Write a protein that binds this ligand. Structure first.
Ligand SMILES: [Mg+2]
Ligand SMILES: [Mg+2]
Ligand SMILES: [Mg+2]
Ligand SMILES: [Mg+2]
Lengths: 123, 143, 96, 145, 53, 106, 70, 112
RNA sequence: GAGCCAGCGAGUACAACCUUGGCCGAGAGGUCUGGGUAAUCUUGUGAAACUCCGUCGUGCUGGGGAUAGAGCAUUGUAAUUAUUGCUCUUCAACGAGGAAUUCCUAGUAAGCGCAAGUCAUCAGCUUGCGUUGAUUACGUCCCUGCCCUUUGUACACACCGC
């Protein structure tokens, strides 16, 4: 063994760089929408939630999950700083628990929750 | 008598111009040839492919000659047509702007087009002469 | 109603100067024209005045209009201090 | 331009990239018929090759075919802008790439799998067997896969 | 007095009120009227607008 | 002593047409009296302001419409004449309804 | 497919034999007398117009009406 | 100031309408019928047709003055550039608005 | 490919409107600069459908463009439940539609685009506009509705009646 199955990733290389690249780098190595978002004024989006996540990471039992960070800001994008931490994406009812992974990278928080309950009767 | 540019039936004139350009081999290539659509609505690049550009240039020159002073946007507008936009009805969207600009530049380099005041471009003397010659040739051919 | 009293006083003074007041029907507006106070506050004040007589109010076309009655004028004067032979618009300044 | 003189009859239906290139017709058309190449792309490929679009081209040459295959394989090596492609910008930090046959299908499958793994809204929709790109199924398309 | 009592209402249906009702429904913003259509109709003659053809 | 001709355009915009015409006539008369070089009353295309509106408030019943419209009438009188004269003209010949207006700068 | 697209020497020869005859030769006419399909037919027509044989009547795109000499 | 001519005209019309509305609202007791607006240079003449002209006036410049002030406040004008006048109506019965107003008043009072 | 012609309009200074002209970009779109508060500048809105010469020839084909995947753009605070645009790729149903039923009598019908309206951004909608421009009546009460007249009426909340 050497390479673990295959790299869980964005556009090329491996994980070791993902976790330690901060935000600008990520943006540079991301889609167009994301870039646009980054360009526009960031105030209240990456501020408090991020801090909370960091705190959770710090004060975990080690090996087990961090504390669940609840989120209205479902508009936010999954940057690599908080891969592993659990986020409670809001859907009117329920802060739906979403687990952030090495593949969930560069997608919106709101697109892992689903607000409605899907249709029955006939699929 | 008096030979003129208008006496020739357009398409023929354009063809002649294209031929002349080909003979010259000095209109200069853009770089996008057959890696280019020509309009934002045309689900197929130019069928002629090699050449075509020359013809386009000639057409542009002719247009310039006809009008007082012409620019890029206007040219694009003239060129573009209907997008088979889908199940939606047709709009009018303008043609390849960059390509048009390139063509204009080429013309300028040649000495067809001259930069005008107010806005856009008009015609050079040499270019005019060339056009006249082409017209004459066309007339001769017709005869 | 919750007014820093200074602002209220200022408003009153302005009213006295005028003999009239024109406001918007626009709450959330940060500061009124002429007076350096919130428009909402001014409106509230006007309403209060109306409730204890004094002012006459019209709500036409998103514009509150306000005029003082004799009693109202007197009240205003009392609030201020200014004794007699004073501004409003009950009589002309000179020739206009 | 010219009618095909000489004996002719050089192979009805050629096999290329694990798929059926149809005889006669035209190179572009053949490419299109392959699961993964389209019209404009096909045209571009033809241009690169340097064959006439007028020719029916089931009587194509072997060298030409090879060249075409090579072109299909490699965007970056040849003069293809690399934003004209099927796929572009993929894995971690790296390069744009595309396939055009069986290969293309495989790539698509892989992408789908990835999406599923991610469990993104789109992925979820795909899983369901539904409408990924938010088109209203209140009235339209009442049969489905 | 409270801090957050305002979403950015620069543009859209919410910003553009009418002059009379202050509604966001059938707003004629053509020629800088800014009038809910019914209201305009009611007053159109006074505002110079007459029916001919 | 001066006789400094600035070249002055009088605009004449209105809704009411007859009134406007009358005003124009008056202006012309004044000019004649003062005896000046001027271009006659030029008439520009009548800009029409159209407001199409569903006759209904509630949008219930048949779908009927009312095209309410406004006629704008815009005239130009170009005077090759002095400043004082222009001022005088401005002072006399003002009617209700018509928007009298002066450009002054050629 | 209904065939009549395949190209041969023999086929060419038969086509040639001959431009003479027929009041008018129209791509349409050529196909289907069961000859080489559309484009091919057009090409043949063009060839026939090289040195006499079949002179033209119309010249339009797709409405190309030709007739025997002389 | 300085806008498209048509636009300006429209604005003016709107203003006039507003004024009319205000008059209807406010000068109910006075028996107001209609406004006449003449926009000359410097001064602007706002003529008012009402039944109770004296009432409208007040007592040698009061109510009218107040109204003027209000108008100024509304539309960013200065003192002098607005001139109000309260005039009589030539034959009230020929007017319609006035009649309507009268009827309304009667109704309010409580008549058959 | 080439030819290349309209009419209604609309359009900003306290905002951010239309935006030519120049350079970058396959595009979309960026940029610098203007001109326009408007018979002046956008705008001859050189709109389409059309016309000409060539390429495919009657094969679910290059007809048809849906669903799809990816990227590039833009609007906005926010685009996943694709806003829209563009680029490549996918190529589904559908060979003129049964019972039924709509609209129409001349610059009409039908086609074709423009146009403002809503509008930060989105046109398959809408009110207008012009361009191309026919077929067949120029009658009748067969149907449908409506109108009257004469008739009959235990109805008058009037046939959903009594
Ligand atoms: Mg089409
Ligand atoms: Mg014009
Ligand atoms: Mg196909
Ligand atoms: Mg709509």
């Amino acid at each position: 063994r050497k390479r673990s199955f295959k790299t869980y990733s964005y556009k090329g290389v491996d994980l070791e760089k993902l976790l330690e690249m901060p935000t600008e780098d990520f943006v540079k190595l991301a889609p167009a929408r994301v870039r646009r978002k980054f360009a526009r004024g960031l105030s209240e989006k990456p501020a408090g939630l991020m801090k909370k996540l960091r705190a959770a990471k710090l004060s975990a039992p080690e090996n087990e999950k961090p504390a669940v960070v609840r989120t209205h800001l479902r508009n936010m994008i999954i940057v690599p700083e908080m891969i592993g931490s659990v986020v409670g994406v809001y859907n009117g009812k329920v802060f739906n628990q979403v687990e952030i992974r090495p593949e969930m990278v560069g997608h919106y928080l709101g697109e892992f929750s689903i607000t409605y309950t899907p249709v029955r009767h006939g699929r | 008598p008096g030979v003129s540019v208008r006496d020739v039936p357009a398409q023929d004139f354009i063809n002649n111009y294209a031929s002349f350009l080909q003979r010259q081999g000095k209109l200069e290539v853009p770089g996008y040839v057959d890696i280019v659509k020509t309009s934002a609505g045309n689900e197929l690049p130019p069928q002629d492919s090699e050449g075509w550009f020359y013809k386009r240039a000639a057409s542009v020159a002719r247009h310039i000659y006809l009008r007082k002073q012409v620019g890029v946007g206007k040219l694009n507008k003239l060129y573009g047509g209907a997008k088979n936009r889908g199940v939606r009805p047709h709009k009018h969207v303008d043609a390849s702007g960059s390509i048009n600009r390139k063509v204009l530049q080429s013309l300028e380099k040649l000495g067809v087009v001259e930069i005008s005041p107010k806005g856009g471009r008009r015609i050079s003397d040499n270019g005019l002469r060339d056009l006249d010659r082409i017209a004459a040739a066309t007339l001769e051919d017709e005869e | 109603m919750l007014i820093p009293k200074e602002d209220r006083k200022k408003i009153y003074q302005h009213l006295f100067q005028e003999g009239v007041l024109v406001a918007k029907k626009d709450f959330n507006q940060p500061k009124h024209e002429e007076i350096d106070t919130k428009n909402l506050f001014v409106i509230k004040a006007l309403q209060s005045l109306t409730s204890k007589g004094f002012v006459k109010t019209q709500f036409s076309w998103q514009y509150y209009y306000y005029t003082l009655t004799e009693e109202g004028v007197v009240y205003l004067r009392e609030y201020l201090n200014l004794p007699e032979h004073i501004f409003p618009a009950t009589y002309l300044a000179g020739q206009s | 331009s010219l009618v095909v003189q000489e004996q002719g009859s050089f192979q009805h239906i050629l096999r290329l990239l694990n798929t059926n290139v149809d005889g006669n017709i035209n190179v572009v058309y053949a490419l299109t018929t392959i699961r993964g190449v389209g019209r404009r792309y096909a045209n571009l490929v033809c241009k690169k090759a340097d064959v006439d679009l007028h020719k029916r081209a089931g009587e194509l040459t072997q060298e030409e075919l090879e060249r075409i295959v090579q072109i299909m394989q490699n965007p970056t090596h040849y003069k293809i802008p690399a934003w004209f492609l099927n796929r572009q910008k993929d894995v971690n930090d790296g390069k744009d790439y595309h396939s055009l046959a069986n290969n293309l299908e495989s790539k698509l499958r892989d992408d789908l799998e990835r999406l599923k793994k991610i469990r993104s809204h789109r992925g979820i929709r795909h899983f369901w067997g539904l409408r990924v790109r938010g088109q209203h199924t209140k009235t339209t398309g009442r049969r489905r896969a | 007095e409270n801090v957050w009592y305002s979403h950015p209402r620069k543009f859209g249906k919410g910003s553009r009120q009418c002059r009379i009702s202050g509604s966001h429904s059938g707003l004629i913003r053509k020629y800088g009227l800014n009038i809910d259509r019914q209201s305009f109709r009611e007053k159109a003659n006074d505002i110079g607008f007459y029916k001919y053809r | 002593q001066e006789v400094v001709i600035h070249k002055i355009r009088i605009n004449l915009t209105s809704t009411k047409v007859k009134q406007l015409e009358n005003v124009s006539a008056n202006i012309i008369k004044n000019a004649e009296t003062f005896k000046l070089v001027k271009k006659g009353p030029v008439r520009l295309p009548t800009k029409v302001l159209k407001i199409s509106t569903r006759k209904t408030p509630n949008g219930e019943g048949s779908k009927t419409w009312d095209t309410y419209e406004m006629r704008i009438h815009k005239r130009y009188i170009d005077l090759e004449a002095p400043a004082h004269i222009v001022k005088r003209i401005t002072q006399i010949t003002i009617e209700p309804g018509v928007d009298v207006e002066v450009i002054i700068a050629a | 497919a209904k065939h009549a697209v395949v190209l041969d020497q023999d086929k060419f020869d038969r086509i040639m034999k001959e431009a003479p005859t027929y009041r008018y030769v129209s791509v349409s006419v050529l196909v289907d007398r069961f000859k080489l399909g559309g484009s091919l037919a057009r090409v043949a027509l063009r060839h026939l117009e090289n040195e006499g044989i079949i002179k033209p009547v119309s010249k339009h795109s797709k409405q190309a009406i030709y007739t025997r000499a002389t | 100031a300085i806008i498209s001519k048509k636009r300006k005209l429209v604005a003016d019309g709107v203003f006039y309408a507003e004024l009319n509305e205000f008059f209807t609202r406010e000068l109910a007791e006075e028996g107001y019928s209609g406004v006449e607006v003449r926009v000359t240079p410097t001064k602007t003449e706002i003529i008012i047709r009402a039944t109770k002209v004296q009432d409208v006036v007040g007592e040698n410049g009061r109510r009218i003055n107040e109204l003027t002030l209000l108008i100024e406040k509304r539309f960013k004008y200065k003192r002098g550039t607005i001139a109000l006048y309260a005039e009589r109506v030539h034959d009230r019965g020929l007017s319609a608005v006035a009649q309507a107003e009268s009827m309304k008043f009667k109704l309010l009072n409580g008549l058959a």
